């Protein structure tokens, strides 16, 4: 079996905002690394572009 000696190997905490997480870690005395939230960028979609008269976007299949 898989053995461990780490008592915190399973602990996961959930926070509303990064500030709450940072405050919790600071008051508990843990060194922390924060990563900014990554969101998908807004993309311009257009169905008609699939059938461009002169553009490269035209679909070869459908």
């Amino acid at each position: 079996w898989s053995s461990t000696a780490d008592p915190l190997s399973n602990l996961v905490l959930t926070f509303s905002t990064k500030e709450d997480a940072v405050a919790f870690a600071e008051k508990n005395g843990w060194s922390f690394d924060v990563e900014e939230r990554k969101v998908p960028k807004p993309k311009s979609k257009s169905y008609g572009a699939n059938f461009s008269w002169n553009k490269r976007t035209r679909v070869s299949t459908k």
Partner: peptide
Amino acid sequence: IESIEGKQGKPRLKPPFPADVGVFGC
């Protein structure tokens, strides 16, 4: 229109309507 352009005869979604983007995209 798709079958004229050398593809499988599968319908497109509207919009666009053919008066905007039709055969060969025209």
